[PDB]
Design a protein around this nucleic acid. Structure first.
Ligand code: CA
Ligand code: CA
Length: 214
DNA sequence: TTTTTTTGCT
């Protein structure tokens, strides 16, 4: 009936303060709104062909399942580092240690974006930001993970210039697990390769911010 | 909220 956390309302050219969360995008938002004419094609062609094979209500249910399987997977690791997918990654967890961060936020003070990275930990003695994920079809080459490398280096560059973090990171790791328990493909990205993908991430970033001008 | 997940052949 009464407030428990009291604070008063008063205290004894027009302003237009922008809202930071509006003008500072998220990594996933930068990439999803700067997809290539090829990505849009195969994605639209994949939805039309899947809705035809499962209907509108079914394809909406499909989206729900594969979304939850992932989210539950990510949470499971968040607990472990503190199911069929878990058996698939067991041969990778043996090589991971030195966990410095999990489901933690990164903000780029200068390039002005933000994100939530899955994990920061040592893989075979190499500190990288790690990007877990489930997948139905197999992904044997880093090319099969599409924009995921960009998402990873966006997170790295953000952390390396986020004063909430006392350390830097130079490598990236994409782990693709499978429901049938097949071992997980580890797609590692050494410092040099992350510099390659980083340059391409700046392009997507700059394409996005130009898109937001109009 | 962010993120979860989704991508061909001739
Ligand atoms: Ca995530
Ligand atoms: Ca992930």
């Amino acid at each position: 009936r009464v407030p428990q956390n009291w604070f008063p309302i008063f205290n004894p050219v027009p302003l237009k303060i922008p809202l930071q969360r509006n003008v500072i995008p998220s990594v996933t938002r930068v990439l999803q709104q700067t997809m290539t004419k090829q990505q849009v094609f195969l994605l639209e062609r994949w939805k039309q062909r899947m809705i035809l094979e499962l209907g509108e209500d079914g394809f909406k249910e499909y989206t729900s399942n594969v979304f939850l399987q992932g989210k539950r997977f990510h949470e499971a690791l968040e607990s472990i580092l503190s199911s069929g997918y878990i058996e698939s990654v067991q041969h990778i967890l043996k090589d991971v240690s030195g966990v410095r961060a999990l489901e933690s936020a990164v903000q780029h003070e200068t390039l002005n974006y933000i994100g939530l990275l899955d994990c920061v930990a040592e893989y075979q003695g190499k500190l990288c930001v790690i990007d877990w994920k489930t997948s139905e079809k197999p992904k044997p080459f880093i090319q099969s993970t599409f924009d995921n490398p960009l998402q990873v280096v966006a997170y790295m560059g953000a952390m390396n210039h986020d004063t909430n973090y006392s350390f830097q990171v130079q490598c990236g790791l994409i782990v693709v697990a499978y429901k049938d328990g097949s071992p997980a493909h580890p797609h590692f990205m050494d410092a040099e390769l992350c510099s390659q993908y980083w340059t391409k991430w700046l392009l997507r970033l700059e394409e996005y911010t130009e898109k937001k001008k109009n």
